Amino acid sequence: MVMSLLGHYNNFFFAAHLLDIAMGVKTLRTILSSVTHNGKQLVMTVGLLAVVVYLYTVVAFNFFRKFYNKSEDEDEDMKCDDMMTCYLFHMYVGVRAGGGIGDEIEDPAGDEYELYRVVFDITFFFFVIVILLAIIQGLIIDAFGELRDQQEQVKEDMETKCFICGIGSDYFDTTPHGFETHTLEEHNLANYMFFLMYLINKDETEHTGQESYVWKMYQERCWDFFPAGDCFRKQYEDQLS
Amino acid sequence: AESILEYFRPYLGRIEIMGASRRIERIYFEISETNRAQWEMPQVKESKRQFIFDVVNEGGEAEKMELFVSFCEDTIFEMQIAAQISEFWGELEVQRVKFLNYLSRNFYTLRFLALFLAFAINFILLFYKVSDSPPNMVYYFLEESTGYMEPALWCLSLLHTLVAFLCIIGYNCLKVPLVIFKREKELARKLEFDGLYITEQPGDDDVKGQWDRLVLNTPSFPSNYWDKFVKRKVLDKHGDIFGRERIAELLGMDLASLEITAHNERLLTWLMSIDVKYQIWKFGVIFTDNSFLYLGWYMVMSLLGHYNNFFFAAHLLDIAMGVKTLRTILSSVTHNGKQLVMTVGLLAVVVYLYTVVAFNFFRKFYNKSEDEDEDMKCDDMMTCYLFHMYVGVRAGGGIGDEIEDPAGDEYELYRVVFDITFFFFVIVILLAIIQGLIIDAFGELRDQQEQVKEDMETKCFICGIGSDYFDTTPHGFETHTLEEHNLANYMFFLMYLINKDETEHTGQESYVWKMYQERCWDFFPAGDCFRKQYEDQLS
Ligand SMILES: Nc1ncnc2c1ncn2[C@@H]1O[C@H](COP(=O)(O)OP(=O)(O)OP(=O)(O)O)[C@@H](O)[C@H]1O
Ligand SMILES: Nc1ncnc2c1ncn2[C@@H]1O[C@H](COP(=O)(O)OP(=O)(O)OP(=O)(O)O)[C@@H](O)[C@H]1O
Ligand SMILES: [Ca+2]
Ligand SMILES: [Ca+2]
C-alpha cells in the first residue's frame, strides 16, 4: 500500500507492483520455493567467490603489475597500483569474462614469466569459472529433486496407512476394497472433527455414557482415546467378522 | 510411594542383557548426578551424533558391538580428561598447571579469535600502493587521511602471532592426550589377543604398524592406557609356547626372574633422567596428525608475517575449516577427487591428439602473425600444444574462432570437420563431465543423511528388531528405545562397573564383568527384547 501511495508522487513506482505474481500465481510460487530452499547455503557459497579472487589479486599485484595496463595508446589505467582496483578488475571483469582473466591482459609471449602466467590463468579458468559457478548452478538442480521427493512421501504414506491407527494397508486388503472401506467409514478424519462440533454444541446433561468419557479426557488434554494400534477388526477377527 | 519414584528417575538406570540362563534379563543400578551432568554437553552431544553416522552408513553388523564398546571407552577417558582441567623453586610450578587448565578450558575461543584478526589484517592490506619514489620501487602503504592506520598494523601483527602460538599449546594439552590413548589401546589388543609381534609379523607395509616396533621395550609403554599390567599378561600367555626368555626380552622386562621382589618387598635437578625412546615414539605419532599439522602450518605463516609481506592473505582459508556448513559443500567436491583428476588428465590427451593433426595439415593457418614480417605458432610442437590449451579450451567457441577463415578452396571441408568435432568433444562433452561430477556428488552426499536417519527411526540399534513389531502398543517403539535399550544406560553401566569395588559385584554384574575382560560380546540382546520373550505368558 505504501508504494501505491507514493505513486501519487507520480513516478515509476508502479513498476514494482508486478512482483506480486510471485505471491499471486499458484505454480510460479513453487519454482521460487526451490531456489529459496537453500538460501542459507548459497549466500555462503558466493561469499566463497569474494575470497578466492582476493587470493588471486595479491598474486597479480606483486608479479603481473606490468600487464594490466588497460592503458590504450598515449600517456600510460595501470589498473594495478592500488589494491582497490585490481580487486575491482578481477571481479567486475574477472568472473564476468567467461574465458578466464587471460582474455583481457597482454599476451604472455614475453620471455619473462611466459610459463608462470599461463599457470596463473588456467587455474583461474578451472577454479573460479567452471567449478565455483557450477555449484551455484548445481545448488538449484538439487533443490528440485529435494522438493519433488517430498510430495512423494506425503503421497506414498497417505495411501498405505490409516493415519489414525497406523496399521498398513497390507493387512486390510485381505478383503475386497479392505483399505478402501476402512479409511472411509471407520476412521475418516472428518467424523473425528464432526464429533468435536457435536460435543461442544450439545448440552452437558445430555451426554451418554461414552460421549461423557471422551469429554472429560478432552478437558484434561489426554489423548488416550484415539485407537492408535487397533481397528475393531484386528480386535474381533477371531470371534466373528 | 510417588514422591520417591519421581525424585529418583533421573538415577534409576535400566539395562537389558542375556546370558547364564540363555534368557533375557534385566538389571538396575545408580547412574549418579556427577556422571549424568557430563553426558549432555556440546563437546559430547556431537561426538555421539557423528559416531552413529560412522556405523549405520560405513560400518558392518558383526563388528558393530565391538566398535561400539571401544567408543564407549574413548568417552570415559574424555570425561576424565575434562573433569580435571576445570577450576622460584616450587612457587612457579603451581601457577603453570593452573594456567594451562585455563588455556585448554576455552580453546575454541582462541581458535575463533585468530579468525577474527585475519579479517582485520586483510582489511588493512587493502590499501597498499606501489611507487618508484619514496613518499626499484617501494611499497608505500596508502592511508585515507588517518595516520594511525599503519602503527596499528605493527600492533595487530604481533598480537595475531601470539594467539596463533597459544593455540598450539592449548591443543597439545587437550586433544593430544587422546590421540595417544587411541593408539596405546590399539596396540595392547594385538598382543594380548593376537600375536602381532609374537606369532605373526606386520605385513611389511602399513608403517603405522611398523613404527610401533620401537615402543615395545620402552620402560613405560602404557602411559595413558588404564591397564598398566599388559606386559605381565602377554608373558603368561605366550611364555610357554614361545621362548619365555625371548618374549620376556622383547618387552624389555629386565630381571624376569627378579621381577617378583616389587610384590615381595614393599624438580629441575635430575629431570635429564627420562626416557628418550618412548619420547621419540610419541613425537612420531603427533607429527602425522592431519589436524596438528594444519594447526602448526597455520603458525608458520603467522611467523613469516613478521617478515612483513602479503602472507596474512593466506589465513582467510580457515573459513573452510572454521564454518560449519561451508565445510559441507567442500565435502562433495572432495568426494570424487580420485575420479576427477583422471578426467582432466583426459583433457591433456585429446588436445594432444588434436595437435599432431593441425601440425601436419593446418600449419598455414595459425599465423597469428599480425601484419608485417610474418607468430606462426605452429612450427615446433611445444607451441601449438600450448596454443590449443591456453586458448583452445578457454575459447568457449571451439578453436575455429582464432584461426584464418576456411573460405580458401584447399581443405575448405577438411577443416570445418576438424573444428566442429573440436567444439562438440572437448568443449561440450569433456567439460560437462567436470560440471557433472559435482551434481552427482550432492545427490551422493544427500541420500547418505537419509540412510542414517531412516534407520535410526526404524530399528532398535541394539536388538535390531524393527519398529513395526513394537508399535502394536501405543508409543511401543517410543517407550522401548527410551527405557529398555537407551544407548546411554549401556554406557552408564561401564562407568558403574569400573568405579565399583570388585568384592561388591552382584550375581549379574560379575558375569558381565568377566565377559568384558575376555572381550566376548555375547551379552548384548541382539535378537530379543524381553517383550518378544514373555509375550506369551503375560504382558
Ligand atoms: N481418516 C483417514 N485415514 C487415513 N487416510 C485418509 C483419511 N482420510 C483421508 N485419507 C486419505 O486421503 C485419500 C483420499 O482423500 P484425499 O486426501 O485425496 O482428499 P479427497 O477426499 O480426495 O478430497 P480432495 O482431494 O478434494 O481433498 C485416501 O488415500 C486416504 O488414505
Ligand atoms: N538405544 C537406542 N536404540 C535405538 N535408537 C536410539 C537409541 N538411542 C537413541 N536412539 C535413536 O535416536 C533418536 C532420538 O535421539 P537422537 O539420536 O535424535 O538424539 P536426541 O536424544 O534427540 O538428542 P540430540 O538430538 O540432542 O542428540 C530416536 O529416533 C532413536 O531411534
Ligand atoms: Ca444425563
Ligand atoms: Ca561378594
Question: Could you tell me which of B204, B206, B168, B156 has the C-alpha nearest to residue B186?
Answer: B206
Classify residue A205 by its DSSP letter. Answer: G
Classify residue B391 by its DSSP letter. Answer: I
- How many angstroms separate the alpha carbon of residue A218 from the centre of ligand 1? 25
- How many angstroms separate the alpha carbon of residue A212 from the centre of ligand 3? 9
**DSSP state string for B401-448:** GSS--TTSSTTTTHHHHHHHHHHIIIIIIHHHHHHHHHHHHHHHHHHH
Cα A101 to Cα A105: distance, rounded to the nearest angstrom: 7
Q: Which residues contact B372 (CB under 8 A, 6 or more apart)?
A: none
> Which of B17, B68, B453, B487 is the best mutation target for the ligand 2 pocket, counting ligand atoms within 8 Å of the beta carbon and taking the most?
B487
Q: Which residue of B has its CA nearest to A82?
A: B129
Phi and psi torsions of B436, nearest 5°: -95, -25
**DSSP state string for A67-122:** T-----SS------SSSSSSTTHIIIIIHHHSS-STTSS--TTSSTTTTHHHHHHH
Cα A83 to Cα B142: distance, rounded to the nearest angstrom: 10
Q: How far is CA B237 from CA B226, B343, B519, in A?
A: 20, 54, 16
Mark residue B41 as left, alpha or beta (left: phi above 0; alpha: psi -120 to 50; beta: remaining).
Answer: beta
The one-letter amino acid code at B316 reads: L
- The residue whose CA is least distant from atom 23 of ligand 2 is B45
Classify residue B481 by its DSSP letter. Answer: I
H or E element in which residue B256 lies: none
3-state helix, strand, coil in chain A (%, to 5): 55, 0, 40
A130, B434 Cβ separation under 8 angstroms: yes
* B321: three-class secondary structure by DSSP: helix
Q: Which residues contact B326 (CB under 8 A, 6 or more apart)?
A: A44, A45, A48, B319, B320
Cα B490 to Cα B10: distance, rounded to the nearest angstrom: 15
Give me B171's grid cell.
591443543
Find chain A residues with C-beta within 8 A of B321's C-beta.
none
Mark residue B376 as left, alpha or beta (left: phi above 0; alpha: psi -120 to 50; beta: remaining).
Answer: left
Give me B471's grid cell.
508399535
B520, B500 Cβ separation under 8 angstroms: no
Cα B534 to Cα B539: distance, rounded to the nearest angstrom: 7
Contact yes or no for A83 and B125 at CB 8 A: yes
Alpha carbons within 13 angstroms on the beta-carbon side of residue B256 total 16
Cα A178 to Cα A96: distance, rounded to the nearest angstrom: 62
Contact yes or no for B130 and A102 at CB 8 A: no
Cα A123 to Cα A101: distance, rounded to the nearest angstrom: 10
Phi and psi torsions of A168, nearest 5°: -70, 155
Contact yes or no for B435 and A146 at CB 8 A: no
Cα B281 to Cα B217: distance, rounded to the nearest angstrom: 12
Cα A18 to Cα A24: distance, rounded to the nearest angstrom: 10
Cα B157 to Cα B121: distance, rounded to the nearest angstrom: 8
Of B313, B328, B389, the CB nearest to A55: B313
Contact yes or no for A228 and B325 at CB 8 A: no
* Helix boundaries (H) for B455-506: 467-470, 476-479, 489-498
Give me A45's grid cell.
557459497
Q: Is the CB of A158 under 6 A from ligand 1?
A: yes
H or E element in which residue B30 lies: strand B24-30
Cα B31 to Cα B494: distance, rounded to the nearest angstrom: 10
A231, A179 Cβ separation under 8 angstroms: no
Our CA angle for B521, B527, B532, nearest 5°, is 135
Our CA angle for B483, B484, B485, nearest 5°, is 100
Residues belonging to chain A:
241
Burial of B133 (0-12, 13-18, 19+ CB in 10 A): exposed
Cα B433 to Cα B437: distance, rounded to the nearest angstrom: 6
Question: Could you tell me which of B397, B448, B52, B325 has the C-alpha nearest to residue A43?
Answer: B325
* B18: three-class secondary structure by DSSP: strand
Cα B305 to Cα B300: distance, rounded to the nearest angstrom: 9
Phi and psi torsions of B370, nearest 5°: -75, -130
- Which residues does residue B138 pair with via DSSP β-bridges, in sequence order? B131
Q: Is the CB of A185 under 6 A from ligand 1?
A: no
Place of cell 556428488: B441
Cα B491 to Cα B13: distance, rounded to the nearest angstrom: 11
Give me B217's grid cell.
621395550
Tell me how crowded residue B129 is: count the other CB atoms within 10 A of its CB.
16
Cα B513 to Cα B333: distance, rounded to the nearest angstrom: 47
Buried b (16+ CB within 10 A) or exposed e, B399-437: bbebbeebeeeeeeeebeebbeebbeebbeebbeebeeb
Query: Angle at which helices B230-238 and B181-192 pack, to 10 degrees?
Result: 20
The one-letter amino acid code at B93 reads: E
Question: Could you tell me which of B395, B458, B454 has the C-alpha nearest to residue B426?
Answer: B395
Phi and psi torsions of A119, nearest 5°: -55, -35
Q: Which residues contact B426 (CB under 8 A, 6 or more apart)?
A: B347, B350, B351, B354, B392, B393
Cα B234 to Cα B348: distance, rounded to the nearest angstrom: 57
Classify residue A222 by its DSSP letter. Answer: -
* B29: three-class secondary structure by DSSP: strand
Of A82, A131, A229, the CB nearest to B472: A229
- The residue whose CA is least distant from atom 19 of ligand 1 is A158
A159, A151 Cβ separation under 8 angstroms: no
Of B125, B127, B473, the CB nearest to A229: B473
Cα B202 to Cα B205: distance, rounded to the nearest angstrom: 7
Of B128, B310, B438, the CB nearest to A134: B438
- How many angstroms separate the alpha carbon of residue A208 from the centre of ligand 3? 7
* B215: three-class secondary structure by DSSP: coil
- The residue whose CA is least distant from atom 1 of ligand 1 is A188
A64, A120 Cβ separation under 8 angstroms: yes
Residues of A near B (Cβ–Cβ under 8 Å) read 40-41, 44-45, 48, 51, 54-55, 58, 61-62, 65, 81-84, 87, 98-100, 102-103, 108, 118, 121-122, 125-126, 130-131, 134-135, 137-139, 141-142, 145-146, 166, 224, 228-229
Of A54, A81, A100, the CB nearest to B394: A100
Contact yes or no for A126 and B396 at CB 8 A: no
B228, B222 Cβ separation under 8 angstroms: yes
* B240: three-class secondary structure by DSSP: coil
A46, A136 Cβ separation under 8 angstroms: yes
Q: Which residues contact A120 (CB under 8 A, 6 or more apart)?
A: A56, A59, A60, A64
Classify residue A228 by its DSSP letter. Answer: S
Q: Which residue of A has its CA nearest to B375?
A: A109
Alpha carbons within 13 angstroms on the beta-carbon side of residue B471 total 15
The resolution in Å comes to: 3.8
Contact yes or no for A142 and B319 at CB 8 A: no
Cα B275 to Cα B273: distance, rounded to the nearest angstrom: 7
Find chain B residues with C-beta within 8 A of A166's C-beta.
471
- Which residues does residue B30 pair with via DSSP β-bridges, in sequence order? B12
Contact yes or no for A137 and B435 at CB 8 A: yes
Q: Which residue of B has its CA nearest to A51?
A: B316
Which parts of B are annotated binding residues for caffeine? 226
* B473: three-class secondary structure by DSSP: coil
Ligand 2 nearest atom to the CA of residue B460, by list position = 4
Q: How far is CA B455 from CA A18, A241, B70, B326, in A?
A: 47, 37, 22, 27
The residue among B138, B301, B382, B442 with the most chain A CBs within 10 A of its CB, best to mutate, is B442
B105, B85 Cβ separation under 8 angstroms: yes
Q: A229 vs chain B: nearest CA distance in angstroms? A: 5
Cα A213 to Cα A220: distance, rounded to the nearest angstrom: 11
Ligand 2 nearest atom to the CA of residue B462, by list position = 3
Q: How far is CA A56 from CA A80, A103, B509, in A?
A: 13, 16, 64
Place of cell 575470497: A51
The one-letter amino acid code at A225 reads: F
B366, B384 Cβ separation under 8 angstroms: yes
Q: Which residues contact B437 (CB under 8 A, 6 or more apart)?
A: B336, B339, B340, B343
Phi and psi torsions of B13, nearest 5°: -70, 150
Phi and psi torsions of A4, nearest 5°: -65, -15
**DSSP state string for A124-172:** HHIIIIIIHHHHHHHHHHHHHHHHHHHHHHHHHTTTTB-SSS--BHHHH
Closest ligand, as measured to the CA of B467: 2
Q: A166 vs chain B: nearest CA distance in angstroms? A: 9
3-state helix, strand, coil in chain B (%, to 5): 55, 5, 40
Place of cell 600502493: B129
Tell me how crowded residue B185 is: count the other CB atoms within 10 A of its CB.
19
Q: A149 vs chain B: nearest CA distance in angstroms? A: 12
Give me A28's grid cell.
510460479
